[PDB]
Structure formats: structure tokens, C-alpha cells
């Protein structure tokens, strides 16, 4: 099954009352770590992280995050100066990796300014893709440090994947479980002469689910309306797909196929 590890950073200049800096880590859809400029402490966000990582992990990363917080503030200040921007602006970072089912891996590192792509790292050419002339100025300064580029490529391809495999083992009872979906089909005449069919699923984990409507055994040409995959609040998810009308709903979840004939 595909899994990922990602760390986010959010910096806000001149915030209301709201932390100046927040950093959160995730394994798949699960928060694992948190740090902000108010607590000034890195803490676990999953009990399987708290039980498997000794206090020295949290103590050391608290210090590193206090340094990264200070760097983020300065970087956001320089971006505002380059853009000639006043007031409150946001700066974001996302770093991470994925370990695919076939054992292959992906790695990514990206920055955003005011919630829009700003700089995207290409670990295969060791270069930063810039969206505008300010991002280009930063790209030139960052690409001048060859050692840092190589360090980032190593971290994405080796370190990130080793951390992800370690955290996957810690959280295996959560992350590697399967809760099959409970699926139902509801039929109703809506506007006169228009029948809608809803295929609804709930109680499933992992959130990844494939739902479609088929006619006489073939895919439709008519429009399918898709419901978002939503958290139900108990660690499981729900989703739906609907059509207007031999129809059958097809659901695939974690290597199991299901057909509901109407």
C-alpha cells in the first residue's frame, strides 16, 4: 500500500492576537507531530509516535525547530522586501516522500508565498523551478549552494524514506489496518420523471476508495456526481457517487471489489 511522510511549515508576518510559525508532520492522513511559536515545543500528535520515540527525539527537534522558526521569519521578511509588500503575508513549506506499493519512491520539496506555488525543487536536476522574478532571485541564491542541494536530494531519497518506514512500523496497528466499507444504494424519484441513484459508503479505512456506476456491465457516458472522501470522526471515512437513470455500483477498497446491482 502507498504511504507518505510530509512536514509542513507555515509562517505568518504580523499575525492577529494566531502563531507566527507552525510546523506539522503527517504520515498518510495522520498528524504525527506539532510545533508552533507559542508552545516552542515539538510534540507528538499520535499515541504511537509518543510511545516509540524517547524524550531526546522531542528535545532535539524542539531545538532544531526553534532554529528553523527563526530562519522562516527572516526568509518571509526578505520575500516581502522583494515584492515591496506590507502587512500580513504567508510563507509555506512542504517536504516529504512516498513509498509506493511496488517499492519505488518519490520525494518533494516546495515553497508557497501567500498560498500560491513559489519555488518547486527538482531533485533530479538539482534545481529550483521559479514562478516569477522574485522566486528567480531566491532560486539563484539557493542554487549557488551545491552542498545544500545534494543534502536535500539525499534527505528526500534516503532519510525521509527511512523515517517513513520507521514510523509505519510504529503506527502499523493504525496505518496498515483495513476497515472494509459498508455500501448501500438508495433510489429516489426527484424532479418529476428524474430518478437518482446514490451509491453510499462509510466505515472504511484507508480513505482511498474507488466508486463508480456501470450500465449493463460498461462504463457510463452520462455524468456521475462524486462525493468527497470525508472523515467520519472515528478514524474511518465516507464517500458517495450518484447518477440519473441495468445499473450497478462498483466499489474497490484495499484489494476487494464489490458490486451492488440495482
Amino acid at each position: 500500500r502507498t504511504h507518505s511522510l510530509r512536514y509542513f511549515r507555515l509562517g505568518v508576518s504580523d499575525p492577529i492576537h494566531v502563531p507566527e510559525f507552525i510546523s506539522v508532520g503527517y504520515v498518510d492522513s495522520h498528524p504525527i507531530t506539532t510545533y508552533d511559536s507559542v508552545t516552542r515545543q515539538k510534540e507528538p500528535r499520535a499515541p504511537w509516535m509518543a510511545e516509540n520515540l524517547a524524550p531526546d527525539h522531542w528535545e532535539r527537534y524542539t531545538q532544531l525547530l526553534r532554529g528553523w522558526q527563526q530562519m522562516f521569519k527572516v526568509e518571509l521578511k526578505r520575500l516581502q522586501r522583494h515584492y515591496n509588500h506590507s502587512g500580513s503575508h504567508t510563507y509555506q513549506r512542504m517536504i516529504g516522500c512516498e513509498l509506493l506499493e511496488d517499492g519505488s519512491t518519490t520525494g518533494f520539496l516546495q515553497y508557497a508565498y501567500d498560498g500560491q506555488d513559489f519555488l518547486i525543487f527538482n531533485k533530479d536536476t538539482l534545481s529550483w523551478l521559479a514562478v516569477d522574478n522574485v522566486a528567480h532571485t531566491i532560486k539563484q541564491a539557493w542554487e549557488a549552494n551545491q552542498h545544500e542541494l545534494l543534502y536535500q536530494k539525499n534527505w528526500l531519497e534516503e532519510e525521509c524514506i527511512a523515517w517513513l518506514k520507521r514510523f509505519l512500523e510504529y503506527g502499523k496497528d493504525t496505518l496498515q489496518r483495513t476497515e472494509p466499507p459498508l455500501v448501500r444504494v438508495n433510489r429516489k424519484e426527484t424532479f418529476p420523471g428524474v430518478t437518482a441513484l446514490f451509491c453510499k459508503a462509510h466505515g472504511f479505512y484507508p480513505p482511498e476508495i474507488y466508486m463508480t456506476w456501470m450500465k449493463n456491465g460498461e462504463e457510463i457516458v452520462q455524468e456521475i456526481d462524486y462525493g468527497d472522501i470525508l472523515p467520519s470522526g472515528d478514524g474511518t471515512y465516507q464517500a458517495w457517487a450518484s447518477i440519473e437513470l441495468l445499473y450497478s455500483c462498483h466499489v474497490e477498497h484495499s484489494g476487494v471489489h464489490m458490486v451492488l446491482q440495482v
Epitope: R40, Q63, L64, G67, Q70, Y151, E159
Partner: antibody, heavy 108, light 111 residues
């Protein structure tokens, strides 16, 4: 957890010397070499984090991440190369583990 | 780069001592190491940025002050002969950044 480099090496002026450094760490974020003349401060020589050899004048630094091995190679040795050479490996938490240093003696 | 003082100091057992260190390279991270024969450098205390400090590997008998972004002082509360050593201050830009070392401070603690 562990890093090893020879205590001392002796080579002849004009020749070549290879200083080996092996490390076993909990994760890896780079391998550094420093030069430290007697009674002076250490000064940065090289950094390797991907596999390969980097040349900087008469000095080259090699890394094999799969073998947890690095070497510092000094060519056309001069009496001024007599110094201690420190290798340091950065672990997964960006902490350095330092070798005890190699004292390099150059025979005129 | 990194300016540390004093170069040499003789102390009597139980005497107090402060080593000074300043860097003008705009580095967030600063470190205090001791160097002793036959072993690798040992971190005493470090400061990941202004406003924070933390223990290294051998913090006992020492304390530090990150006075501002430039300066990081090391204090020997009650000098002990085991503290006879060569002390190095250093700074780094962080991540893959190398260390920049101060000139070193040779301390000898005598009964």
C-alpha cells in the same frame, strides 16, 4: 554511534596518502573532513553526502554511503600538509559524531 | 569569522571562569566543544539560535549564555582539574553547513 579513522599515518613528501574514515550512524546527513594544524583551530576541508569523489586542488574527498566509508586523499604531499585530519559524520538528527583524528606525518 | 577569548588561562580548583565567543557571520547556530587527547571533539552546550540553548554530550560543570545573535559565552561554575582542556567555540549556518571554529582556549585547572 561509531566512527573510526587511523590514529596516525606517515607518508613521504611528493607522494600520496589516503586517510580512511568508516562510520556506523543512526541515519546519515553528510560526512565532513577538517584540517587541524598543531596548536590551531580545525578548518573545513570537504563535505560529501552523495556518492562520489570531489576534487579541491591537491585534496580529494570520497564517499560510499552503502559502505559507510569515506577517504580524504592528499596528492603531491608537502611538509605543510603535516596536521591532524578530522572526519565527522552527521546523523539523522543532524548531530555530528567525530573521529578521534588522524595525525599525518610527512617524511622529507 | 569566530572570535573567542582567552587563548590561555590558569585556574585554581573551585575558581569561576567565563569564556567569550562572538561571530559576525550571521549564523543562528553556535557551539562549545572541548578537545582532549585520544578522542573526538565533545560538545558541551549548543545554541540553535538566539533565545535558545541546550546541553551537548558533556554539560556537567558548565553552563552557557546565548547573550544575543553574535555571542555565546561558556561558564565554568567551579573549576575542576578534569576541565583542563582546549575549548573551541564554533558557529554554523545549519543543515549541511560546515563549522567555523574560534582560535581555541587552553585552560589548566590546578589544585
Amino acid at each position: 554511534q561509531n566512527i573510526d579513522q587511523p590514529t596516525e599515518m606517515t607518508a613521504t613528501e611528493g607522494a600520496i596518502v589516503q586517510i580512511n574514515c568508516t562510520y556506523q550512524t543512526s541515519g546519515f546527513n553528510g560526512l565532513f573532513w577538517y584540517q587541524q594544524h598543531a596548536g590551531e583551530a580545525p578548518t573545513f576541508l570537504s563535505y560529501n553526502v552523495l556518492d562520489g569523489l570531489e576534487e579541491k586542488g591537491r585534496f580529494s574527498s570520497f564517499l560510499s554511503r552503502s559502505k559507510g566509508y569515506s577517504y580524504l586523499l592528499l596528492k603531491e604531499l608537502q611538509m605543510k600538509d603535516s596536521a591532524s585530519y578530522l572526519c565527522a559524520a552527521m546523523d539523522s538528527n543532524y548531530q555530528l559524531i567525530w573521529g578521534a583524528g588522524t595525525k599525518l606525518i610527512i617524511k622529507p | 569569522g569566530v572570535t573567542q577569548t582567552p587563548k590561555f588561562q590558569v585556574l585554581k580548583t573551585g575558581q569561576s571562569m567565563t569564556l567569550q565567543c562572538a561571530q559576525d557571520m550571521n549564523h543562528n547556530s553556535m557551539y562549545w566543544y572541548r578537545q582532549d587527547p585520544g578522542m573526538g571533539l565533545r560538545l558541551i552546550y549548543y545554541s540553535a539560535s538566539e533565545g535558545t540553548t541546550d546541553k551537548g554530550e558533556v554539560p556537567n560543570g558548565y553552563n552557557v549564555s546565548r547573550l544575543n545573535k553574535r555571542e555565546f559565552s561558556l561558564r565554568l561554575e567551579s573549576a575542576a582539574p578534569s576541565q583542563t582542556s582546549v575549548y573551541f567555540c564554533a558557529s554554523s549556518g545549519g543543515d549541511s553547513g560546515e563549522l567555523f571554529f574560534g582560535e581555541g582556549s587552553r585552560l589548566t585547572v590546578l589544585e
